[PDB]
């Protein structure tokens, strides 16, 4: 059980973002059809880019599908710019029933942000399930709420994140204050890459690296800051790269499943303020 | 009656679109002045779009007038980007009660969509209502949502409608198929142009133009697809082009009106698709 | 007592704007954080800007502060375009305890608007309260809506302001009717300067000249179109300088005090209509 606040002015019907244990963390959004067979593009994108802002992450559920990655294309280009790779806009993100990680790759993704890398670093993701037919075990894509997990700091483990900073390698290298501020909007954020070598942590006692780690993990993986998504067909998805940080839970069986994503730029495109250039 | 399921965060109160006759199509959207005197130029233009972009049809009534053409024109230009003809921003629609059309003009007018034969194609209508003071008999403008009508085909209807496509003359040329994408927002549409030697069908054999035709005016003048709009002074009227067609009701003893009509370029202008170049 | 028509679809808690006596005037709103610790940053810009221009004012209380003006700043230049002064871009108005206007500095400030002997006007006024600590007696900022005054107005009171004109100087000369049309939506507003030999009216016998101070006087400091800000620790203000006059409330003993203000021009830039440039 949950209280219901929104009421758009849009045709669509809001609710808070709740996961599929009835766990409701302090951010996220549902919007649902308003009309019979409505399409997510029915929408207007300007307002979905308001609303993904603000909760963070929206997830649209029950809209008719995009027939195809073109169509997905052509909507994320009028959606804002496209942050485009060398395949082009989407990635493709497609797993079949039991199969195996070659024995070699792991079978979770800890947080982290999108462009850490990269010479410059989208705002969005947006995701596209174009098939999610059975229900699996584990696996979900999990996001983060940074300023929810500040909120449940105490003084001395806030203390110590604001002392800390990350020092990143893949070679690319990447280099943030674990606490920061939103790069356009100000507000405080964390910037994190969690370890599962390449992970230093700078500004503190190496012997506290231990204590950051745990109280990090702590405050991004608890219920308010923290949401698994159960992938379903056509779930459109947009995610605040800037103030998330997103991963996967770990899994036994994977299911088949089949994603998109397009990336699209902040506005204006943001220049990586992390990447090692020197 | 009917239910009311909007509450603005702009000042104004905003319920569902109905006709004179109570019926409430499945678009469209009445917005009102929360305020006693206010003006339309009080509210928000990029909210309006939006708005305008979901619900396709927005009815503005009660809100204090544009002071005369010039006055709407600024206005526009504020508004988004004028689509300019030779005569400039405003077309002026004035009628005189009872006038004959010089016994030649049909009075009636088909469903279709603004920039058919144009280089680019205007995204909105702007009508400011400037005078409509007797109640009239027919002659309403009426309006049709696309999407709407294609949730009202059946199995074969839609099959028929997939394979079909208009061939339009005025001298100008445009072809289109009878469904196809929204031109910047990927949902399924239709682009029809109804007749009353100048409209051809392809696709399609042409013993089953009649049921092409009969079955797309079924959807398309069905109460849930179909707005007719009876003009009082003042009203504000923005209407979606790339989703909706228009036309006109039938009149026998046509009244004393005046409309004041712009055109909105979609943004970035949009090139006519379906102009022939060749 | 007072009833609330507000539901965003943002996580904020939207109400009408009241003045410590209760008093509401027919504009303004206030919004509060929709979640813990919330920053005035989290919420959308682009959304802000609709709201300021529609309720003209906004009051944003109990979010988390702007660190710095070096902070503000950088939120400001994502909000829009800042108006830059040879200073930058925020003017530090910081009071003492007590602190006497040198002897000959007034201790009130006119109804008037930003901009007035500038090149160009800016549309926003952002003030952030950095520190309001103890509660004063009197010199509240003060704002009035000028289509509210103009609701107020009887037959001869308007037939009275439309034939006036200020001319005003300070060297900088400008000049405006005092019933202009906004700058960019057109509406009716109110261009004034008010006096505690440098202020003339046109258009007008001189003698009518006590007549037309009394009246705009009466409508522009009446409840429904004027209201009075206490200031706190955080306060964002956002208002809209192209549709509202503001001024300052006398003071016998000045409080403490810091506010920050930043201006934001209109889109584009608006070249000042009222300069005199011969
Ligand atoms: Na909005």
Redesign the interface.
């Known amino acids: 059980g949950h209280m219901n606040?929104?009421?758009?002015?849009?045709?669509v019907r809001?609710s808070p973002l709740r996961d599929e244990q009835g766990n409701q963390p302090?951010?996220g959004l549902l919007l649902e059809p308003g009309?019979?067979?409505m399409?997510?593009?029915?929408?207007?994108?300007?307002?979905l880019?308001?609303?993904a802002?603000?909760?963070h992450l929206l997830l649209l559920r029950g809209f008719?599908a995009?027939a195809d990655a073109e169509?997905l294309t052509?909507?994320c280009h009028?959606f804002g710019e496209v942050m485009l790779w060398p395949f082009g806009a989407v990635l493709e993100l497609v797993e079949q029933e039991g199969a195996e990680d070659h024995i070699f790759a792991n079978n979770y993704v800890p947080l982290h942000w999108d462009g850490m890398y990269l010479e410059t670093v989208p705002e969005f993701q947006v995701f596209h399930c174009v098939d999610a037919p059975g229900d699996s075990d584990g696996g979900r894509t999990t996001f983060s709420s940074t300023?929810?997990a500040?909120?449940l700091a105490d003084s001395s483990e806030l203390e110590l994140w604001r002392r800390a900073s990350g020092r990143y390698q893949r070679s690319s290298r990447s280099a943030a204050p674990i606490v920061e501020?939103?790069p356009?909007?100000?507000?405080?954020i964390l910037r994190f890459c969690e370890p599962p070598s390449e992970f230093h942590y700078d500004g503190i006692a190496p012997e506290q690296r231990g204590e950051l780690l745990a109280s990090l993990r702590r405050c991004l993986y608890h219920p308010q800051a923290h949401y698994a998504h159960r992938w379903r067909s056509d779930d459109l998805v947009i995610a605040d790269n800037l103030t998330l940080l997103h991963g996967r839970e770990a899994f036994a069986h994977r299911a088949p499943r089949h994603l998109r994503r397009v990336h699209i730029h902040a506005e204006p495109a943001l220049r990586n303020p992390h990447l090692q250039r020197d």
Chains 1, 2, 3 share one sequence.
């Open positions: 606040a929104y009421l758009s002015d849009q045709p809001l302090r951010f009309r019979p067979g399409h997510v593009g029915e929408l207007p994108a300007q307002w880019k308001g609303l802002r603000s909760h008719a995009f169509s052509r909507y009028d300023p929810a500040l909120q501020r939103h356009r909007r100000e507000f405080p």
